[PDB]
Amino acid sequence: HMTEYKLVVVGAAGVGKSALTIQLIQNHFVDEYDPTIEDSYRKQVVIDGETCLLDILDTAGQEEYSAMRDQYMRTGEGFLCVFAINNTKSFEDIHHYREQIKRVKDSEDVPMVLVGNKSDLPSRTVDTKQAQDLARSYGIPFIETSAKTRQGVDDAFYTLVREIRKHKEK
Numbered sequence: 001h002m003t004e005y006k007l008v009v010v011g012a013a014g015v016g017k018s019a020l021t022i023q024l025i026q027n028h029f030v031d032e033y034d035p036t037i038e039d040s041y042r043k044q045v046v047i048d049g050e051t052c053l054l055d056i057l058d059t060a061g062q063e064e065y066s067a068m069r070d071q072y073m074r075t076g077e078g079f080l081c082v083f084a085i086n087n088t089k090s091f092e093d094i095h096h097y098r099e100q101i102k103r104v105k106d107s108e109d110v111p112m113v114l115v116g117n118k119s120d121l122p123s124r125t126v127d128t129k130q131a132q133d134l135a136r137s138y139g140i141p142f143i144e145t146s147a148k149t150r151q152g153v154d155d156a157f158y159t160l161v162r163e164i165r166k167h168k169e170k
C-alpha cells in the first residue's frame with residue numbers, strides 16, 4: 001500500500017545533509033550530529049495523493065569506501081546535491097558530486113535537485129543567481145533551504161520525488 005522512493009543526500013562535509021534529513025523526519029533542528037554517521041532513514045508521507053515511503057541515505061565520510069553507499073548510488077532514484085550558501089567551496093564541490101552520479105548512472109538525465117542550505121545565516125558567499133546559473137546548466141531545480149528554520153526542507157524533498165516521477169513511472 002505505499003510507493004517506495006530511494007533518495008540519496010550528497011555534498012561536502014558540513015553543509016547540513018544530516019540536519020536536513022533529520023528535520024524532514026523529526027521536525028527538529030539538530031545542532032550537533034555526528035559528522036561520521038552514514039545511515040538510511042524512512043519517512044512515510046503523502047505527496048500529491050500518493051502514499052510514499054521515502055528511503056533516504058544521508059551520506060557521510062566520502063574519504064573511505066562504503067558498501068551501503070555503493071548500493072545506494074547504483075540503485076538510488078534521485079539525489080539531493082547540497083551546498084551551504086556560506087561555504088563557497090561546498091558550492092564549487094557540486095561539480096564533483098554531479099559527475100560521480102552521472103558516472104554511476106552512465107547518464108546526464110538523473111533526477112536531482114540542487115539545494116542551497118543555511119539560508120538563515122547572514123554570511124552568504126554564494127548568491128542565488130550563481131546557484132540558479134549552475135542548476136540551469138544542469139537542467140535541474142534549485143531550492144534554498146534552512147534546516148534550522150525548516151524553510152524549503154519539505155519543498156526540496158517533495159520536488160525530488162516529483163523529479164523522479166518525471167523521469168520514470170512509479
Ligand SMILES: Nc1nc2c(ncn2[C@@H]2O[C@H](COP(=O)(O)OP(=O)(O)O)[C@@H](O)[C@H]2O)c(=O)[nH]1
Nearest residue numbers: 013014015016017018019030031118146147148
Ligand atoms: N544555521 C544553520 N546551521 C546549520 C544548518 N544546517 C546545518 N547546520 C549546522 O551545520 C553543521 C553541519 O551540519 P550537518 O548536518 O552535520 O552537516 P553534514 O556533514 O553535511 O551532515 C552543524 O552545526 C549544523 O548544526 C542550517 O540550515 N542553518
Ligand SMILES: [Mg+2]
Nearest residue numbers: 017018035060
Ligand atoms: Mg552528516
Ligand code: NA
Nearest residue numbers: 019023029030
Ligand atoms: Na535537523
